[PDB]
Amino acid sequence: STYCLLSQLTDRDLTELNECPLDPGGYFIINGSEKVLIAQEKMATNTV
DNA sequence: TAACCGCCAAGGGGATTACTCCCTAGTCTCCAGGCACGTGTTTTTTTTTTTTTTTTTTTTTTTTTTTTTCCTTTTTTTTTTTTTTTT
């Protein structure tokens, strides 16, 4: 994301920190567990 | 302008007297509708059982198998020990 430490880093900088340059991210780390948030369908509010 | 009065003339019908007659007053005598008493059969009221729809409750949702993850309380009041200040 923008506010994380892996923001706009190069492949060499990600590799030196033992991170995958091909990793897209998109997940939280909660207690060492990778958690992903699923988008939920809902009705369109304020619609007749 | 004809009401009213005076004068005169004419006639029409209610009052009067008598005769008649006939319809009702009165009195028996028989009998029958008018009336006093009893009651009814429809009319209203009340129960009674059902009917019919609405509402609520309750129970249900194919089976078997294999991996992770999180949690398996928590704040809030009461108690009890400790520390500091004062005479």
GROMACS .gro file of C-alpha atoms (C1' of nucleotides) in nm:
model
  135
    1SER     CA    1   0.000   0.000   0.000
    2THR     CA    2   0.103   0.366   0.022
    3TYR     CA    3   0.177   0.373   0.396
    4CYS     CA    4   0.358   0.038   0.416
    5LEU     CA    5   0.735  -0.006   0.407
    6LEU     CA    6   0.712  -0.188   0.071
    7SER     CA    7   0.583   0.121  -0.113
    8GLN     CA    8   0.747   0.193  -0.453
    9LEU     CA    9   1.045  -0.034  -0.383
   10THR     CA   10   1.259  -0.186  -0.656
   11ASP     CA   11   1.309  -0.557  -0.718
   12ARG     CA   12   1.661  -0.540  -0.572
   13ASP     CA   13   1.537  -0.359  -0.259
   14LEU     CA   14   1.256  -0.613  -0.217
   15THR     CA   15   1.499  -0.901  -0.272
   16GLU     CA   16   1.748  -0.763  -0.016
   17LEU     CA   17   1.462  -0.762   0.238
   18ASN     CA   18   1.382  -1.127   0.143
   19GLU     CA   19   1.052  -1.032  -0.023
   20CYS     CA   20   0.915  -1.154  -0.354
   21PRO     CA   21   0.917  -0.887  -0.629
   22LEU     CA   22   0.629  -1.074  -0.798
   23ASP     CA   23   0.419  -1.068  -0.479
   24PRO     CA   24   0.121  -0.835  -0.539
   25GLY     CA   25   0.040  -0.801  -0.170
   26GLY     CA   26  -0.323  -0.718  -0.102
   27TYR     CA   27  -0.337  -0.895   0.236
   28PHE     CA   28  -0.302  -0.808   0.603
   29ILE     CA   29  -0.068  -0.983   0.845
   30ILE     CA   30  -0.257  -1.062   1.166
   31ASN     CA   31  -0.046  -1.253   1.423
   32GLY     CA   32   0.175  -1.380   1.141
   33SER     CA   33  -0.124  -1.505   0.940
   34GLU     CA   34  -0.199  -1.370   0.593
   35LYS     CA   35  -0.563  -1.256   0.596
   36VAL     CA   36  -0.757  -1.150   0.286
   37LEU     CA   37  -1.080  -0.949   0.290
   38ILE     CA   38  -1.353  -1.066   0.053
   39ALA     CA   39  -1.571  -0.806  -0.119
   40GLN     CA   40  -1.936  -0.846  -0.023
   41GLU     CA   41  -2.230  -0.796  -0.257
   42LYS     CA   42  -2.501  -0.558  -0.139
   43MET     CA   43  -2.793  -0.363  -0.277
   44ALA     CA   44  -2.732  -0.012  -0.406
   45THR     CA   45  -2.836   0.228  -0.131
   46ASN     CA   46  -3.058   0.534  -0.195
   47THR     CA   47  -3.203   0.361  -0.502
   48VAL     CA   48  -3.575   0.318  -0.573
   49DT     C1'   49 -12.719   6.005  -0.628
   50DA     C1'   50 -13.042   5.688  -0.425
   51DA     C1'   51 -13.098   5.625   0.112
   52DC     C1'   52 -13.495   5.729   0.345
   53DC     C1'   53 -13.965   5.869   0.435
   54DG     C1'   54 -14.456   5.899   0.324
   55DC     C1'   55 -14.825   5.739   0.084
   56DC     C1'   56 -15.084   5.414  -0.149
   57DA     C1'   57 -15.200   4.959  -0.349
   58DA     C1'   58 -15.200   4.455  -0.386
   59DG     C1'   59 -15.135   3.987  -0.268
   60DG     C1'   60 -14.945   3.570  -0.025
   61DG     C1'   61 -14.899   3.264   0.325
   62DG     C1'   62 -14.863   3.164   0.837
   63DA     C1'   63 -15.190   3.147   1.218
   64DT     C1'   64 -15.628   2.943   1.371
   65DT     C1'   65 -16.010   2.576   1.426
   66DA     C1'   66 -16.171   2.119   1.349
   67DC     C1'   67 -16.146   1.626   1.188
   68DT     C1'   68 -15.895   1.233   1.138
   69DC     C1'   69 -15.552   0.867   1.173
   70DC     C1'   70 -15.171   0.637   1.266
   71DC     C1'   71 -14.747   0.571   1.492
   72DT     C1'   72 -14.553   0.534   1.901
   73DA     C1'   73 -14.587   0.468   2.465
   74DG     C1'   74 -14.671   0.127   2.744
   75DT     C1'   75 -14.679  -0.363   2.895
   76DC     C1'   76 -14.591  -0.852   2.873
   77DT     C1'   77 -14.273  -1.276   2.712
   78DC     C1'   78 -13.930  -1.503   2.446
   79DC     C1'   79 -13.485  -1.530   2.314
   80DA     C1'   80 -13.016  -1.389   2.145
   81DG     C1'   81 -12.625  -1.093   2.049
   82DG     C1'   82 -12.311  -0.810   2.395
   83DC     C1'   83 -12.008  -0.870   2.715
   84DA     C1'   84 -11.709  -1.087   3.108
   85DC     C1'   85 -11.362  -1.430   3.153
   86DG     C1'   86 -10.985  -1.741   2.982
   87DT     C1'   87 -10.636  -1.802   2.677
   88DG     C1'   88 -10.354  -1.857   2.237
   89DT     C1'   89 -10.000  -1.902   1.902
   90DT     C1'   90  -9.683  -1.586   1.685
   91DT     C1'   91  -9.276  -1.279   1.820
   92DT     C1'   92  -8.892  -1.161   2.026
   93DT     C1'   93  -8.493  -1.299   2.305
   94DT     C1'   94  -8.133  -1.603   2.435
   95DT     C1'   95  -7.837  -1.994   2.397
   96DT     C1'   96  -7.566  -2.324   2.121
   97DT     C1'   97  -7.313  -2.528   1.819
   98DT     C1'   98  -7.076  -2.472   1.416
   99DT     C1'   99  -6.806  -2.222   1.039
  100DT     C1'  100  -6.459  -1.989   0.834
  101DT     C1'  101  -6.091  -1.736   0.811
  102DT     C1'  102  -5.676  -1.548   1.052
  103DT     C1'  103  -5.286  -1.598   1.332
  104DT     C1'  104  -4.934  -1.836   1.573
  105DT     C1'  105  -4.620  -2.226   1.660
  106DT     C1'  106  -4.304  -2.560   1.524
  107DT     C1'  107  -4.014  -2.824   1.258
  108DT     C1'  108  -3.743  -2.903   0.860
  109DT     C1'  109  -3.354  -2.823   0.524
  110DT     C1'  110  -2.857  -3.549   0.092
  111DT     C1'  111  -2.429  -3.809   0.303
  112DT     C1'  112  -1.897  -3.908   0.361
  113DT     C1'  113  -1.387  -3.719   0.399
  114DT     C1'  114  -0.938  -3.385   0.463
  115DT     C1'  115  -0.665  -2.923   0.614
  116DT     C1'  116  -0.608  -2.459   0.906
  117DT     C1'  117  -0.714  -2.044   1.279
  118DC     C1'  118  -0.937  -1.819   1.715
  119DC     C1'  119  -1.095  -1.891   2.138
  120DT     C1'  120  -1.164  -2.179   2.540
  121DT     C1'  121  -1.378  -1.359   2.913
  122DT     C1'  122  -1.388  -0.894   3.113
  123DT     C1'  123  -1.471  -0.491   3.313
  124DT     C1'  124  -1.630  -0.320   3.765
  125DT     C1'  125  -1.699  -0.301   4.225
  126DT     C1'  126  -1.525  -0.437   4.678
  127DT     C1'  127  -1.156  -0.559   4.983
  128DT     C1'  128  -0.699  -0.553   5.185
  129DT     C1'  129  -0.233  -0.430   5.228
  130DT     C1'  130   0.094  -0.051   5.208
  131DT     C1'  131   0.266   0.409   5.260
  132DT     C1'  132   0.267   0.875   5.433
  133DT     C1'  133   0.153   1.249   5.770
  134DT     C1'  134   0.073   1.420   6.231
  135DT     C1'  135   0.106   1.486   6.747
   0.00000   0.00000   0.00000
